[PDB]
Design a protein around this nucleic acid. Sequence first.
DNA 1: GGCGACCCGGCGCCCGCTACGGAGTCAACTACGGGTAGGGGGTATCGGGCAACGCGGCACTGAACACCGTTGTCATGTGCCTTG
Length: 48
Amino acid sequence: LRDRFGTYFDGSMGAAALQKRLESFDLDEEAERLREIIRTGKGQKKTR
DNA sequence: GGCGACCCGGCGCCCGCTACGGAGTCAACTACGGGTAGGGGGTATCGGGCAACGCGGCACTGAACACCGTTGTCATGTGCCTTG
């Protein structure tokens, strides 16, 4: 994946990847989308 | 394709204190090079031991004046005797 094409996707491994993800994580839109899911949802997906 | 059991992991705990034993353990080597640290050697600096010598009360120095006290002393005033 790296060799055939680059400068498009950034990848990593270990806790550094998690730190990068949480740094750029946008929890507000996740909360909004999960509220939308809760409004119209069924099953154990609702509990998750 | 969410329900469903079931399965599994995964975890959570599991009366109270005193008082009451010990035990302690298996597989390299040398060469160099520095640097610190020790030792003694010698040296500038700080600290300890004594009589004059600062003081002060008073004391002596009485010496030299002062303070009353005293019998020195004087020239000058009453009382009796002699003469106007």
